[PDB]
Design a protein around this ligand. Sequence first.
Ligand SMILES: N#C/C=C/c1cc(Cl)cc(Oc2ccc(Cl)cc2OCCn2ccc(=O)[nH]c2=O)c1
Lengths: 538, 405
Amino acid sequence: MVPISPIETVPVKLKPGMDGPKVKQWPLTEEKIKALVEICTEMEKEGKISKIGPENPYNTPVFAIWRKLVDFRELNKRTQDFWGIPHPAGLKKKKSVTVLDVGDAYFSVPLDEDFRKYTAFTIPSINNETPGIRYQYNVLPQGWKGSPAIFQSSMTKILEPFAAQNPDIVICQYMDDLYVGSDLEIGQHRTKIEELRQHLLRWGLTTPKEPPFLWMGYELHPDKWTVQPIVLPEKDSWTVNDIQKLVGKLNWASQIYPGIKVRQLSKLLRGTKALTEVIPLTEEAELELAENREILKEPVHGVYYDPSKDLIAEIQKQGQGQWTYQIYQEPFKNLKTGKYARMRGAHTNDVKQLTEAVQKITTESIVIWGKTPKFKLPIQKETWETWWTEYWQATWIPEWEFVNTPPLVKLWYQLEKEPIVGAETFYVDGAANRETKLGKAGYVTNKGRQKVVPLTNTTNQKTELQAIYLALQDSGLEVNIVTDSQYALGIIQAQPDKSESELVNQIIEQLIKKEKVYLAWVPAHKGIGGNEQVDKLV
Amino acid sequence: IETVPVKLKPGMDGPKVKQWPLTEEKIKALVEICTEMEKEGKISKIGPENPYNTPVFAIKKKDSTKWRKLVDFRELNKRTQDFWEVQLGIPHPAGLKKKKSVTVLDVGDAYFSVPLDEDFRKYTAFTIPSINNETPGIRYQYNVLPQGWKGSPAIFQSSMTKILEPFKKQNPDIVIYQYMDDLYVGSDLEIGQHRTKIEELRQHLLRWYELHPDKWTVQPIVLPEKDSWTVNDIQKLVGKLNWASQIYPGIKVRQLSKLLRGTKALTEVIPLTEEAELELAENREILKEPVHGVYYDPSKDLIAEIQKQGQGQWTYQIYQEPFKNLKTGKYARMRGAHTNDVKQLTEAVQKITTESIVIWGKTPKFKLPIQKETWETWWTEYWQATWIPEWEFVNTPPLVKLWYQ
Ligand SMILES: N#C/C=C/c1cc(Cl)cc(Oc2ccc(Cl)cc2OCCn2ccc(=O)[nH]c2=O)c1
C-alpha cells in the first residue's frame, strides 16, 4: 500500500463565548433509520466518520432524503468566520481545455482533530427503546460553514508545485472543479492531464464532461462563448417578484446581447417589498419587453481574450439616461457587451453620465482582463476639453478617441465668465408666502424693461427660478442676469441639460437658444439697487 | 529583537476589508515583491482560518522605477488601540514648521527588523488578487512590523531614539520628527550643507523630498484696487465682503451697496463716493488683522477643503470649526499633470496632508470636489505617499470658489 501524501488540517475554533452545539434528534421512520445506519456503516469503513459515546455532550440533528442530510445550522452559527465567478470573456483562447471535478471533495480532506468532537450527530433507534447511535466526522462535512474554504485552500496547496513545474499549461481553480488550458498538442495535453490527476492522486484526490460546457449559466464552446437560453415568461397578469425575475434575467442577458433595456420595467419596482401585485405596462414598457424579445430572437456569441491585441470599449447613448457598451478586440467580434443607467438625481447632463459609464467599464475591465480598454466615445475632443476645463469638479477619462455615431454627446449651453458689453442687464427676483403659497416673480432692467408675474401654489425657490426664466424669455440673444438666489445659481452652475423639474427644463431650453448669457450673483437684502425684493413682496 | 504585546480597542474585531481590483502589472509587482519578502521571513502565507483582510496595491515613488508595496491600513489604524507610551504622548515639535528647511526620508526598511507580536499578526492579513478571479488570491500576514500601520512607529520609537541619540547630541539645532514610515528633519542650513548633512544622517542610519516650510506662510483676504469700478466689480466686492463678514467682525457693506442703487448695466463705471472709499479702507484695515480666537484643538478632527481654480491652480483651507481657518493655501505646482485633473488633485491632497503632518502632527479629513466614482477609480495611480488620509465628496458647487482667488 503506497501511502497517500498527508494533508495538514486547518485549525478551527468556535466563536468566543460559545460551546459546541446541543440539539435534540427528530423522530425518523424505520426506513430512514435503517438507511442511515447502512450509510454510516460503510462511511465508517471508509474512515470518513467514527463512533463516539456519552463523553460528547454535543449533538447535531440528522434527516434522510437514500441520502444522509446533516443539519449544521446551529454549528454554522457557532463556527468561527472563514475567509465572484470568472467571466468567460476574460478566459484566454487555448488549443485544449480540460475540466476535472474532484470526486468526494470534502470527504477527501481531513477535519481538524480537535474540532471533530463538535460535529457529532445521533441516529435514532427503533421505537426509541435504545440509546441512539453516536457518530462524529473525521473529514469536512457537507453543509459545514468552513468546508469550502478549507477544501479550496487545501486544493491550492496541493496544486501549487505542479503549476510551477508546468508553466506551459494554465490551471484555473474555481470551487470543486479544475479547468486546465494549454496551447500544446492534444497528445502532450492529455499526457499532462494524466500527470496532473496522478499528482492529485498522490494526495488522494480522485478525478474522472466535454465541450460545449454548461457552466454557471454560460455556454462555453471551443472558439466562442454565450449565455444559456433565457426564458421570459409571457403573462397577461404580472407581479412584483415576477418583474424581479424578469429584470434579473434581462440583466443577465445584457452581457452578451446588445441593446437590452431594463428601465421601464424597473420604474415599476419603486415602493416595492410586496410579493404579489398586478401592474400595467406603459406602451414604452410593452415595446421595451417586445424589443427585448426581438433582440433575443436570434443567438449572439462572444469570443475569448487575446492578450496580444488591444482592448477596446465603445459606448452609445441609448436615451433617457440609458447607455450601452461593447468591449471587443477585432471589429464585429465582441468580448462582451453591457449597459449603464444614470444615477438617481434631480438634475443631470450627458457628459457626466458618459463619464460615470466610463468609470464602470474601467472597473469591470480591470476585474476581467486586468487592464483599462481604449475607449471610443460619441463626443468630440473639443467638447470634452471645454467641459473638463470649465467644470468646477475634477474629472478624467482614460485614453479615448472620438467615434462619430449619433446621437453625439454635446454641451448645450455655456455661461460667460465675464459680464457682456452691450447686453441688457436683467435684475431678477422672486418670493413667496409660506402660508398661502402665493408669490411673485419678475425683473427690472437698465433700459427700463420691467415685469412682475403673480403666481399661485408656489415656493420661494420656484419663484426664484421663475424670475430667471422670465428674464430669459424677454431678452435678446445676449443677456446679463443678476440674481440673489443661491439655489438657482447652484442649479445652473451644475450645468444640467435635463431635469425632473419642468421649470428648470424650460430654463435650459431658453439657455440653448441664447448666444451669450452671463449669470451674476449678489447677496440679498443689502440695499443693492435694481434687485427689488419689494416689487415681489407685495 | 523582543516582541511587545499589542491588542485592539475594546469591543473591536480585526479589519475585514474588500480588496479592490488591481491591474495586471501591479499584481505582478506585488507577487514578485511578496515572494521576496516571504523568502526574507517578513511575511508568511496563511490559511482560510484567518477571516481578516486589509487592502493592498502598488505604487512608484519619486525618481524611482521600482514598484513599492502600499498597504492601506486606515481601518486597522482606527481599530488599533490608541497608542500611548512611556513617552507620555510626545508633543509635536512646533519648531519643525518654523524651520528654514525640512527633509523627508523613508525609514520603512528599519521596521522589518523588529518582529510583530504573534497574537496580533492575524490582523495584518492581506490578499494579492487574481485577474478575473481565475484562481484564489494569495494570502499573507506580517511576521515583522508592517509599513503603514500606526503601531509600528510607536513600537519602534525607543529603538529610533537609541539610534538618533548621537545625532541629536552632536548638533542639537536639528529638529527631528517621525510620522509613520517617514522621518522629517528640520534645519536652518544651506541646501548644499543640508544635502550633505542628509547623506550623513542616512548613512548614519545605514550602519545601524526637500520641503521649505519657511517659504510656506499664511495668506490674507485681499480686495481689488481699482481706479474705476463697474457695477459688476462692486457687486463682486460686496459679495466677497459679505462673505468675509462671517470671518471678520466689523465688515460693513452698506455704503458700497449704496452705490449699486438704481438699475444700471453691469459694465457701467460707477465712481466711488467718499463714504464708500472710507468704508472700503476700513474693511482693508479689518482684513489686515488676524482672526479672533483661533486655536488648535488636538481632540478635534482637522478638515481640509479644496477648490479647483482652473489652469492648474487649486486653493485649500484647513480648519476645525467653520470660518476659523488654521491654514490656507494655493497649489499652482505643475509637474506632468497638465491634462489630468485627478492627478493634480491627488498631488494637492498629498501636499496638504504632508504640511498637515508637519504642522499639527496628524492628517486631516478631506472634502474633495470630485465625484466618488471618479476618484475611487483613479486615485491609486497617482499616489506616491506611504500614508493615506480620510476623505469625502462634495457634489454641490461652492459659491466661495472665486472668493478664494
Ligand atoms: N464546465 C466547465 C468549464 C469551465 C471553464 C471555466 C474557466 Cl474559469 C476556464 C476554462 O477554461 C480555460 C482554462 C484555462 C485557460 Cl488558460 C483557458 C481556458 O479558456 C476557456 C476558453 N475555452 C473554453 C472551452 C474550450 O474548449 N476552449 C477554450 O479555449 C473552463
